[PDB]
Design a protein around this ligand. Structure first.
Ligand code: FMN
Ligand code: BOG
Length: 364
């Protein structure tokens, strides 16, 4: 754990250690309005011994939402709710980035004001569910809907929404933003060949499939500066329905594209739930050459594997998702080898403080 507990520079920030709390949707936002709130501020502040917190995905617009009760980042009230979170986290000595979210086709009309979802194409995500508010207090799991293909004007609108969301994140006191371009969501629906059947400049070729990513990143950087922009990618997981035919080429190219933009970090989502594909070390080393900023990995890491990934030169920082839900003091536990509590799946999403802020710190 020695390297894990070394500080690191992230742009203008000096971070305390190499541990990341990655984005974790908890579906706790206040209703009406999808507003980040008090229990969320406590929850994040409890976990501020991380070197970096990345917020749960926060939708950039009404039609960017995939799941019931996720917090937005587009209304004044939403910005203010996030400000209480960032104030709480900063009072603990910690950096926090907002994960800007557009789910594309991974949604249901019930979550997007009755609208049809949008995507690169008209392809439904196969074997994917989201959840909606069915009036009860538990999430209602539902099949996703068939999307409509984005027009040029839709592309411009979504870019504008991302750009503004980045400014809104700065107004909310975040230290930066993370673009969610992973786990089968909108940008990923353009990147991955089998999800993109466009015949315009946003599909077919590799250059074309990376174009939407390129243009979104350019707008984010123009708005808030490259030192405040991270990006999340999922080269090899396919759980939410996006498959690429040549992911080593596509994602090495994506990494090099992002390197050109000088984004402050690249975050690889190596596992999504139970989807834990073989991610060859040779490929990780290629990503390390293609992108020369801070490289973050998350997915089924423990203390041993995290330390090894850093010492092998594969990663600079490591995120721990599920363990951070149940262990607010995860860094201390990893450092000492204290046993980790396990999380309760039934309280991941929705509800209140139970299963959110009532996981204790370690006590022998
Ligand atoms: C409850 C839960 C919610 C999640 N929601 C998001 C999210 O909002 N954005 C995201 O990029 N990943 C999300 N993820 C994925 C995690 O960031 C992480 O990559 C994944 O859980 C693998 O890491 P782990 O094995 O350490 O949990 C979520 C994971 C969990 C368990
Ligand atoms: C009862 C708890 C059910 C846990 C099973 C999780 C259902 C899907 O969970 C979803 O996973 C996505 C990544 O695939 C995330 O981006 C979303 O934030 C999350 O809501």
């Amino acid at each position: 754990x020695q390297s894990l507990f070394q500080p690191i520079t992230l742009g203008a920030l000096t971070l305390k250690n190499r541990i990341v709390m990655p984005p974790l949707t908890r579906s706790r936002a206040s209703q009406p309005g999808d507003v980040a709130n008090h229990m969320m501020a406590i929850y994040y502040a409890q976990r501020a011994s991380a070197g970096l917190i990345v917020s749960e995905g926060t939708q950039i617009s009404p039609t960017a939402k995939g799941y019931a009760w996720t917090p937005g980042i587009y209304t004044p009230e939403q910005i203010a709710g996030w400000r209480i979170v960032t104030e709480a986290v900063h009072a603990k000595g910690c950096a926090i980035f907002a994960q800007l979210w557009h789910v594309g086709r991974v949604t249901h009309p019930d979550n997007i004001d009755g609208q049809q979802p949008i995507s690169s194409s008209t392809l439904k995500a196969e074997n994917v569910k989201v959840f909606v508010d069915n009036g009860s207090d538990e999430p209602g799991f539902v099949d996703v809907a068939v999307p409509r293909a984005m027009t040029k004007a839709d592309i411009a609108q979504v870019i504008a929404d991302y750009r503004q969301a980045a400014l809104n994140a700065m107004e909310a006191g975040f230290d930066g933003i993370e673009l969610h371009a992973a786990n089968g969501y909108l940008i990923n629906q353009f990147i991955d060949s089998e999800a993109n059947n466009r015949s315009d400049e946003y599909g077919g070729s590799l250059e074309n499939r990376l174009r939407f990513l390129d243009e979104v990143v350019a707008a984010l950087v123009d708005a808030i500066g490259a030192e405040r922009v991270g990006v999340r990618l999922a080269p090899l997981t396919t759980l939410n329905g996006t498959v690429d035919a040549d992911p080593i080429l596509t994602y090495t190219a994506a990494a090099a594209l992002l390197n050109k933009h000088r984004i402050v970090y690249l975050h690889i989502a190596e596992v999504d739930w139970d989807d834990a594909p073989d991610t060859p070390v040779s490929f990780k080393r290629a990503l390390r050459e293609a992108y020369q900023g801070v490289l973050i990995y998350a997915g089924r890491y423990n203390a041993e594997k995290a330390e090894q990934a850093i010492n092998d030169g594969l990663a600079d920082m490591i995120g721990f998702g599920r363990p951070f839900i149940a262990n607010p003091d995860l860094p201390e536990r990893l450092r000492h080898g204290y046993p980790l509590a396990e999380h309760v799946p039934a309280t991941l999403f929705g509800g209140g403080e139970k299963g959110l802020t009532d996981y204790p710190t370690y006590q022998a």
